[PDB]
Amino acid sequence: GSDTQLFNRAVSMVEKNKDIRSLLQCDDGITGKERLKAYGELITNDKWTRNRPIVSTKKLDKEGRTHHYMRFHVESKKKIALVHLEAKESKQNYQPDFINMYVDVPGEKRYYLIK
Numbered sequence: 001g002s003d004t005q006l007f008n009r010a011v012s013m014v015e016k017n018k019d020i021r022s023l024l025q026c027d028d029g030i031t032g033k034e035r036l037k038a039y040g041e042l043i044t045n046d047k048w049t050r051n052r053p054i055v056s057t058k059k060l061d062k063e064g065r066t067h068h069y070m071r072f073h074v075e076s077k078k079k080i081a082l083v084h085l086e087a088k089e090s091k092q093n094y095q096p097d098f099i100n101m102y103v104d105v106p107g108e109k110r111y112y113l114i115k
Contacts (some may be wrong), residue, residue, distance in 0.1 A: 003056040006087075006096065007072045011038035014083050014103055014113055015074060023108040024076040038074035038083065065089060068096055074103075081105045085114075 014020060015036035026034035045051035057069040067088045074081040082104045087096040101114035 001053070003070070004054050006056070006068070007038075007040065007054060007070050010070065010085050010098070010101065011072060011074055011083055014038075014081075014101070015076075017113060020081070020103055020105075020111055020113070023103075023105045023111060024081065025078050026076065034077060036074055036076045038072055038081075040072045079106055 015038065021028075021034075024034075024036065026036065028034065040052070040054040043051060054070070054072070058066050059069075060066045065088055067086065069086055071082070071084045074083055083101075084103070085098055085101040087098045090097050098114055100112075102110055102112035104110045
């Protein structure tokens with residue numbers, strides 16, 4: 001499903017961001033590097049073989065522009081983070097455009113990635 005990839009690329013840029021890497025106290029050395037993984041919301045299985053699919057939202061503005069909203073959680077070796085982002089379609093049936101992207105980490109201050 002294309003919706004899943006939408007969150008995959010969003011979490012990838014968020015987990016590789018050095019700014020957020022400091023909040024999760026991640027690391028990166030020749031002896032061992034930290035790796036982060038994320039998923040939609042509540043879950044209790046593995047892969048897509050049998051679990052809850054990711055849900056997506058679509059809304060049009062006064063101009064008729066449809067916007068998409070996707071939110072998911074991320075689990076690191078030190079804690080779990082929440083990523084929320086907003087995207088809008090440009091022209092028509094084209095690549096989604098993100099306008100707002102930020103994360104919330106427990107014990108740390110919320111950090112925006114786009115804004």
